[PDB]
Amino acid sequence: LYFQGNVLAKALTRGILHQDKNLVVINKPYGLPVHGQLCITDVLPILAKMLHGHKAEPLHLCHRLDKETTGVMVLAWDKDMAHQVQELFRTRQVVKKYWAITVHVPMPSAGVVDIPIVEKMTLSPSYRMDDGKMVKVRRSRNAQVAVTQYQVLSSTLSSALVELQPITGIKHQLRVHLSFGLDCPILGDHKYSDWNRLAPQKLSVGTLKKLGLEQSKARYIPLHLHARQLILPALEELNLVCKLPRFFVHSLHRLRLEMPN
């Protein structure tokens, strides 16, 4: 993996968003996993030496992003600083903002989805439906508290650009809260769309026409979930923002969504 790792590390250097004595902030590309297949962990030693020379020890992970998420990712030079940043995340002191394109427009256009999640991720609500009536189900012992704030930034009648702030940090919470809580799955979320994890996301004739795609190609549409911003408390605040990927910019334009003012 070294040849490929070197090339990837150089690519990451070209996209660095912020550098100081403590941190290196990268723009994680689409499809790159954090852990192992080339992954971020494979290039931590390489990127370190690329930035600080042959004596440099590896950079350290401070938090994780999923494979199909893009954008802001903080690395640290020092292990103790990595631990400090990890603790900021654990204790909910970091503002995490994501941008997503959704199929359908959330109603209400701003709010908070607070339904717990159980881990294969699903919602775990207070009631069950039997033969059209509600039956109270005792809270599952493995349900995890999950809270996502959201705000529509731009919308058509059929698509939205949505700002998301996961307050908690539960696996796939943004995707599950949008799809199952709001019936507004993220564009490209084949796994969490149409109650069939094996089937490609179903898109309307009009949405396909805007995108310039036939339904047979919908399966190749990537997830549209970007880690847009992180605000870290002082290690004054560090306010990190990452440009959208070109593919996401393209989809926004095709879907007639606007950037916020």
Residues known to be catalytic: 66
Backbone angles phi, psi at 61, to 5 degrees: -65, 140
Instruction: Provide CB contacts within 8 A for 86, sequence distance 6+.
Output: 62, 63
117 to 113, 174, 258: CA distances (angstroms): 11, 11, 32
Q: Does 210 bind Cl ion (CB under 5 A)?
A: no
Q: How far is the CB of 221 from Ca ion (least distance, A)?
A: 12
Q: How far is the CB of 219 from Cl ion (least distance, A)?
A: 15
Q: Does 140 bind Cl ion (CB under 5 A)?
A: no
Which positions from 228 through 247 interact with Ca ion, judged by CB under 5 A? none
23 forms beta bridges with 76
Q: Does 254 bind Cl ion (CB under 5 A)?
A: no
Smaller CB separation from Ca ion, 40 or 174: 174
Return the sign of the alpha-carbon dihedral for residues 165, 39, 144, 232.
Answer: negative
Q: Does 174 bind Cl ion (CB under 5 A)?
A: yes
Which positions from 138 through 197 interact with Ca ion, judged by CB under 5 A? 190, 193-194, 196
**DSSP-derived 3-state class of residue 229:** strand
Size of the site for Cl ion (CB under 5 A): 9
Which of 38, 27, 28, 82 lies closest to 58, judged by CA?
Answer: 82
**Residues near Cl ion, by CB under 5 A:** 103, 172, 174-175, 203-204, 207, 243-244
**Residues near Ca ion, by CB under 5 A:** 190, 193-194, 196, 199
